[PDB]
């Protein structure tokens, strides 16, 4: 089936957000009824043991997700000291701060498109980030920024010495 392959590609690219039956059917240019057959066949294929992801339905929303049986291996991935998908969430966040400080968790997660609640929490612990103030208003929203212990860690002397971003 080429329809099944397209649906897998769609749902894969959509990631954690997913897609509605309306969108999938509109993309395939077929009825929602026709599309749903395809989704079911794909969802059935991802129930074989050789597949590490499953197709779930959750609010008229379809998405691919990792199976829960594989949750401990996701633990091993992040625990075993290295370049986990966590470390990269730190860098991603830190990078947005440095080039856009003073900044607040509202403004950051707008850019990242995800709860950066945890990256920030570890960005304080390793001492690379801190408060710089608040926006004196709606919620008194904490304004984050780079420490001088961050300038050191990266071998920088000033903030001026950051590679300029012409496309931003």
């Amino acid at each position: 089936k080429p329809a099944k392959a397209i649906v897998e590609a769609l749902l894969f690219a959509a990631g954690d957000e997913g897609l509605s039956l309306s969108q999938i059917a509109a993309v395939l240019e077929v009825s929602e009824l026709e599309a749903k057959a395809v989704i079911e066949e794909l969802q059935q294929d991802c129930r074989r043991e050789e597949r590490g992801i499953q197709l779930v339905e959750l609010g008229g929303v379809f998405l691919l997700a990792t199976k829960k049986e594989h949750a401990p291996y996701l633990k091993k991935l992040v625990e075993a000291p290295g370049a986990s998908p966590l470390s990269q969430a730190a860098l991603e966040t830190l990078a947005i701060i440095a080039y856009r400080q003073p900044i607040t968790r509202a403004e950051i997660e707008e850019i990242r498109g995800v709860k950066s609640d945890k990256p920030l929490q570890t960005l304080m612990a390793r001492a690379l980030i801190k408060e710089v103030g608040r926006a004196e208003g709606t919620g008194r929203p904490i304004l984050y920024g780079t420490t001088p212990e961050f300038l050191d860690y990266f071998g920088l002397k000033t903030l001026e010495e950051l590679p300029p971003l012409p496309e931003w």
């Binding site: 957000e17 969108q23 986990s84 998908p85 969430a89 991603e92 947005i96 440095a98 498109g113 920088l156």
Partner: protein, 150 residues
């Protein structure tokens, strides 16, 4: 001059003098290993002037290249190769012009493969450099956003 010479491209389309010269060498079927200096100089100057008429932006190197060509031409003609340097320059630049086209195709072919952003593994719960930050951020800004479900 009195007339408006016919041109497809504005000077902004070129990556400097070598690039312009390679275009002319192509347009007039010039043999690159045996360049008719006078003729090419004539074609080069006429284009530059035309663009200057239009108050366009002539980068610095175009005027330098003009003086270079006028000078090579004088030396060869007046009493008192001188262009092997320029020929070698052109052949060299041409080599990377072409290599950069091959890269461009790969950029496009790569763009056709869609990836997903990482999963948020914060629940399941570092030596880095400035490059690692720039990398993390370029990887982010490369992310295409798909329409969210309604």
């Amino acid at each position: 001059m009195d007339v408006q010479l016919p041109y497809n491209v504005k000077i902004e389309a070129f990556e400097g003098p070598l690039d312009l010269l390679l275009h002319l060498i192509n347009r007039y079927e010039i043999d690159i290993y045996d360049i008719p200096v006078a003729q090419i100089t004539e074609q080069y100057m006429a284009y530059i002037h035309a663009m200057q008429e239009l108050e366009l932006d002539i980068a610095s190197e175009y005027l330098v290249m003009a003086a270079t060509l006028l000078a090579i031409k004088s030396k060869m003609l007046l009493p008192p190769d001188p262009r092997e340097e320029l020929t070698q320059r052109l052949l060299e630049y041409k080599k990377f012009k072409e290599a950069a086209r091959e890269l461009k195709r790969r950029e496009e072919e790569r763009a056709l493969l869609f990836t997903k952003p990482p999963s948020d593994l914060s629940a399941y719960a570092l030596d880095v450099n400035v490059y690692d930050m720039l990398g993390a951020l370029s990887k982010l800004l490369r992310r295409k956003k798909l329409q969210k479900p309604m």
